[PDB]
């Protein structure tokens, strides 16, 4: 391989500094994606009629 550019990522899952991300080609993007949600809202009913 080679030698180092010192990004001190301590123990991998426990770094306390910013670490360089070796990015590549521009990915597939979507600024307006989907969203699965559970929407809570109230509706008003009368006694004997449907709504």
């Amino acid at each position: 391989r080679g030698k180092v550019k010192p990004n001190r990522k301590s123990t991998g899952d426990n770094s306390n500094v910013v670490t360089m991300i070796r990015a590549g080609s521009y990915p597939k993007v979507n600024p307006t994606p989907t969203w699965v949600r559970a929407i809570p809202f109230e509706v008003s009913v009368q006694s004997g009629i449907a709504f």
Partner: protein, 53 residues
């Protein structure tokens, strides 16, 4: 269908739901309706599980 639930305690809410099968899961715009709600109470709370797209 009239999927109905009744509260066994006068102080407790009455609950009931229904699941939509996969063959009937298309899109619905604002002008559309979801379901008809009937109750002896003046207001009903709804929690709708859905996918926004």
């Amino acid at each position: 269908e009239e999927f109905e639930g009744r509260a066994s305690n006068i102080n407790t809410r009455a609950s009931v739901g229904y699941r939509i099968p996969t063959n009937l899961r298309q899109n619905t715009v604002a002008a559309d309706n979801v379901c008809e709600v009937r109750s002896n109470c003046r207001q009903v709370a709804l929690v709708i599980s859905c996918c926004f797209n």
